[PDB]
Design a protein around this ligand. Structure first.
Ligand SMILES: [Ca+2]
Ligand SMILES: [Ca+2]
Ligand SMILES: [Ca+2]
Ligand SMILES: [Ca+2]
Ligand SMILES: [Ca+2]
Length: 146
């Protein structure tokens, strides 16, 4: 058990948008063509780093198996990111990109923990890097995963 025929089809369709000449490989050049379509014009050096990070057999191009592997890991990654984003948005009651002491205390109460200002301030101090007395998304993630 790993993937359905439909999943593999969608993986192939995506690979094809990179493999411009259908040779079964994505090169630095082909990756460049796609990115240039998306508004980025990376250097050959930048493209080669992008390939080297995922070309497992060090053969210089990415094959469909190599793509499946990097895709599956990116998707799981994005699942985790999304959970963190949705949580940050539960806490950032006003959406200004920062969890304040008042916001955190409000959400904690509803989460079942009726906290004092001193307690919530200590929580924030633990996570606060830029010293602004608020928890911004990076600070939230860094604490939640470490
Ligand atoms: Ca190709
Ligand atoms: Ca660049
Ligand atoms: Ca390869
Ligand atoms: Ca806020
Ligand atoms: Ca902060």
């Amino acid at each position: 058990e790993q993937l359905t025929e439909e999943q593999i089809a969608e993986f192939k369709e995506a690979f094809a948008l990179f493999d411009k000449d259908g040779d079964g490989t994505i090169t630095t050049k082909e990756l460049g063509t796609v990115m240039r379509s998306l508004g980025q014009n990376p250097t050959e050096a930048e493209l080669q780093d992008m390939i080297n990070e995922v070309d497992a057999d060090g053969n210089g191009t990415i094959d469909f198996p190599e793509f499946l592997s990097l895709m599956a890991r990116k998707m799981k990654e994005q699942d985790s990111e999304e959970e963190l984003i949705e949580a940050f948005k539960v806490f950032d009651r006003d959406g200004n990109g920062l969890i304040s002491a008042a916001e955190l205390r409000h959400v904690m109460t509803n989460l079942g923990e009726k906290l004092t200002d001193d307690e919530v301030d200590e929580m924030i101090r633990e996570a606060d890097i830029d010293g602004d007395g608020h928890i911004n998304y990076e600070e939230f993630v860094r604490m939640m995963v470490s």
